[PDB]
Amino acid sequence: EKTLKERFSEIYPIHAQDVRQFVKEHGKTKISDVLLEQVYGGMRGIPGSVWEGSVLDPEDGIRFRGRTIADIQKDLPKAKGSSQPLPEALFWLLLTGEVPTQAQVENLSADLMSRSELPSHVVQLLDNLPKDLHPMAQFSIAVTALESESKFAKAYAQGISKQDYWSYTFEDSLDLLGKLPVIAAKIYRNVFKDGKMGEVDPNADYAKNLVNLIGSKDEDFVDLMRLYLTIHSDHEGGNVSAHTSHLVGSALSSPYLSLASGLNGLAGPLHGRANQEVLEWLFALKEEVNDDYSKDTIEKYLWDTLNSGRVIPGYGHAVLRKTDPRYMAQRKFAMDHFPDYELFKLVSSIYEVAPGVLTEHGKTKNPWPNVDAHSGVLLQYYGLKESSFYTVLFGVSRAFGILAQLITDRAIGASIERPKSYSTEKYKELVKNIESK
Template identity: 55%
Template sequence: MASFLSNSVRSLVRKVPNTATAQATRSVTTLQETLMAQVPGKQAELAKLKKEHGSHVIGEVTIDQCIGGARGIKAMLWETSNLDPEEGIRFRGLTIPDCQAVLPTYSGVKGDGEPLLESLLWLLLTSEVPTKEQVDSLTAELHSRAELPAHVIPLLNSLPKDMHPMTQFSIGLNACQTESVFAKAYNDGVPKTDYHEYVLEDILSVIAKLPEIAAIIYRNVYHDGVVNKDTSLDYSGNFCRMLGYDNPSFDELMRLYLCIHTDHEGGNASAHTTHLVGSTLSDPYISYAAGLNALAGPLHGLANQEVLRWIQALKDKFDAEGKAVNEETITEFAWETLNAKKVIPGYGHAVLRKTDPRYTCQREFALKHMPDDELFKVVETIYQVMPGILKEHGKVANPYPNVDSHSGVLLWHYGFTQYQYYTVLFGVSRAVGGLCQLYWDRALGLPLERPKSVTPEWLWSQVKK
């Protein structure tokens, strides 16, 4: 092992600011120890699969798939989650209700409150459900890694306030790349077999630094620029304090929001981009910055703000006309949207063919915490009538709501009304899924991704055959 690693990050239990906490965490198995024990077995299993079954055919490609965005083509190994069209997302085999039942919460009582993001990070990396003690040790470690390089805050403060928050977010993370342990180790010539150890260091540091970058942008653009921390709290709670929110109910919403947006298997644009750029051996900082740029598109991460705009336009129209917002008026507005050849924001999904479980858990949160909220009632009524309208319309493969159909309304309830910023919250969360997979990309020695493209003439030649 190169001396570079031993001088900076070789110890499996990092020192944290609170000595008592550091001593307590030493009695539990650390995240790093858990992963180092798993890697050899995973490597051997994948090598056996490739050697014994590498020629086994798992699918076929149609011309529609080739020219239609590669939808449904099975061509990527993804460790951390799987999205079934009928069942929805599973994180390491666990559904969202499973995660809510078994992952540690802030209170320490499983099922009492929403899972901590740190617990889902542990689960996605290791495939194991962590103990509360393990999660607490990971929280302390993330807080110890969160300090931004000295040049980053002045850079963020210098950016134009009218620059889109996602553009600022990407710039801020790219600027942190000066701290990359993997980039330095690669330049020092460490062997490929050790890449994953250095990549893990970067992954934990990127995840740790993202909340402050995001909070600085939020406070600069919408408030006074002041960011206050509270590292006595968990990752999500501290993020809420940095944003300027001090409400235990909002803390719970943020825990739920960050957990359910972490991962949605590998084919989505932000996860795939992170994986693709990482396959070039770019470090996790710039790999995930690329993923953020993919997330910033209106067909991906910006979709939730489009939903809120549509709901508010609906409400404003009928308020101005002196009409109640009900099943009849919602149906009228939906058909106006569809007849204008526009989509209904928040409905449909590239893979799912049922109500998105991420929508369902947010609906349950709203029923528990804000059942009388006016916008929630609108969303609930839309949920009752929209599938029937879209089925009648007949041009939507999935007439059911997705995650974006609900998330903006929950944030709005707590006074978080700056919907242009919502995708930044998504970006803080999606780092966990994309970067956990990036760890296993390097641990398993996955190669540079390089699919074969074909020309239209080649496709015509296949048809003529």
């Protein structure tokens, strides 16, 4: 059977020619306006990214290569005896657009584990960093330190042609992905435990390797991380982390510098800590209700929150018109594994009444929860109680979607992202000249 690289080598030329023909025959078609309020409002609504892996369906939720969450939960290969989709199977789908067989996933898992040994200088680096340096900073530092191994950087310096960039980008990406669970686990053991990691089982999959090194053999913990790392793998190219990695990657920086930069954007409080924000709100709610998850007590707390200008964290979509299927997938996991967990029963009680209160409030068009409203409770259940580590887990997942698009961008020879800038003084000049024609 074909490997991932072999199958992608047959698919990318078709995509590259299709893109060139598409732009040649339709490049002059205007697809949007640029209003002054958009360049001053973070380019909101501007089509400014070509991202193949995932598209947000406003009616069915995020779609990975046309597949919904229910689609990948049904079609993607699973580990033996498990019901959860494997994140490396989704990576295959993101990169190629095709569903891999069972044997292709396991061979890809084995290939990832064979690339998972951290170089000596990275282990030394991480063991000496102070514990009060945030794990996301330690995360992107470790990723940057792997640049000495970059096959793409060496290939560029040795005059490799542009049409061969993808191959070394691919190898760097798989080299990087194999070491991400080891880096994340090393940071977790050093900062929060005794600094002792296990060893990488070469037959373990991506998620199982991360959980084992973190320090558990619980198969239910392994299944949760398979679900977690899958559903967080990709969400369009407009978000800060995806856009940052594409931007740095478009100047031909290696996957290591592109992922490290994307992680720093994911570290931003407005981007990657929605998980932590929900959990702090849950604990602040739990301290005043004291096991009372009744309809009246929760609805009163929700009305007092909505009437005080605040919002319910994790609720209210801008575009999605129903409950995030990623939220439902985590809800099914909790109901099958620990339905009587107090922190879940609190989350479940909010889900039972919060859509109705937000609707009655009338200031929320789509009163439904997202993935971040349900992820922290499951992590807490398995002992991942240190929320300052949650964005690291987010980064271990989203790196799949980030590196898939990075490989694709080099395969088609995507150009450097360089828009034009003006000062406010100059924008007032441009606008004055336009409005007086």
